[PDB]
A paper describes a structure:
This enzyme is broadly expressed in different tissues and plays important roles in the regulation of signaling pathways, such as inactivating the T cell receptor (TCR) signaling pathway, activating the JNK signaling pathway, and regulating the phosphorylation of focal adhesion kinase (FAK). The phosphatase domain of DUSP22 consists of five twisted β-sheets and six α-helices, and the structural scaffold is similar to that of DUSP3 (VHR), while DUSP22 does not contain an N-terminal α-helix surrounded by the N-loop.
The S93 mutants were combined with a second mutation, C88S, to produce proteins for growing better crystals, which improved the resolution (<1.6 Å) and helped to determine the structures. This result indicated that the formation of the DPN–triloop interaction through S93 induced precise spatial localization to stabilize active site structure and maintain phosphatase activity. In the S93N mutant, N93 is a barrier that blocks D57 close to the substrate and decreases kcat.
Author numbering: -1 to 154
Write the structure that this text describes.
C-alpha cells in the first residue's frame, strides 16, 4: 500500500518505515532499532532508548535534501559500523526517507541512484521518490557521489 505494511529491512541494520512504524515500540524492539532518522514536517525526538537525527523537510517541489545527505550518511553509517540498527522514516516511508537511504546506498556501493532504488524496492516495494528528489539524486550521482565515497574511505 501507499504507506507500506510495516517497517522493512533494506540492508542489515537499515530499515525504512512510516510515521506509525517509528512510534511502534514493539516493532522497534523486535528489529533492535536504536537510531531513528526522522525526515518529515514535524520531525523531533520522541521515544526513549533511541538516538535521533531529525530533518524537518517537506514533500514539496522546492525541498532540498542534498544538503542533508552527508549528515544522514554519517548518522546511518556510524550506527551500522557499531552493529546497531537504524530506521529512516518519513510520513509514508515512500519519498523523503527513501531518498536519504538511496544516497546512503550509493555511497557504500558503486551504485548509481537507479540501482540504489532497485535495492530499496527489493525490501520496501512502495519506495518511489518524486521527480524533484530524483533530480537531486541524479545530480549527486553525476557530481558528488565519488567524493562522498572517498570521504567515507578516509573517515572509516
Amino acid at each position: 500500500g501507499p504507506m507500506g505494511n510495516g517497517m522493512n529491512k533494506i540492508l542489515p541494520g537499515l530499515y525504512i518505515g512510516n510515521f506509525k512504524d517509528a512510534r511502534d515500540a514493539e516493532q522497534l524492539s523486535k528489529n533492535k532499532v536504536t537510531h531513528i532518522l526522522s525526515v518529515h514536517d514535524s520531525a523531533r525526538p520522541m521515544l526513549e532508548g533511541v538516538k535521533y537525527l531529525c530533518i524537518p523537510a517537506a514533500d514539496s517541489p522546492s525541498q532540498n535534501l542534498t544538503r542533508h545527505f552527508k549528515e544522514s550518511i554519517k548518522f546511518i553509517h556510524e550506527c551500522r559500523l557499531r552493529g546497531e540498527s537504524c530506521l529512516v522514516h518519513s510520513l509514508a516511508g515512500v519519498n523523503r526517507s527513501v531518498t536519504l537511504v538511496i544516497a546512503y546506498i550509493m555511497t557504500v556501493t558503486d551504485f548509481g541512484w537507479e540501482d540504489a532504488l532497485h535495492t530499496v524496492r527489493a525490501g520496501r516495494s512502495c519506495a518511489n521518490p518524486n521527480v524533484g528528489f530524483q533530480r537531486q539524486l541524479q545530480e549527486f550521482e553525476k557530481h558528488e557521489v565519488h567524493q562522498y565515497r572517498q570521504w567515507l574511505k578516509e573517515e572509516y
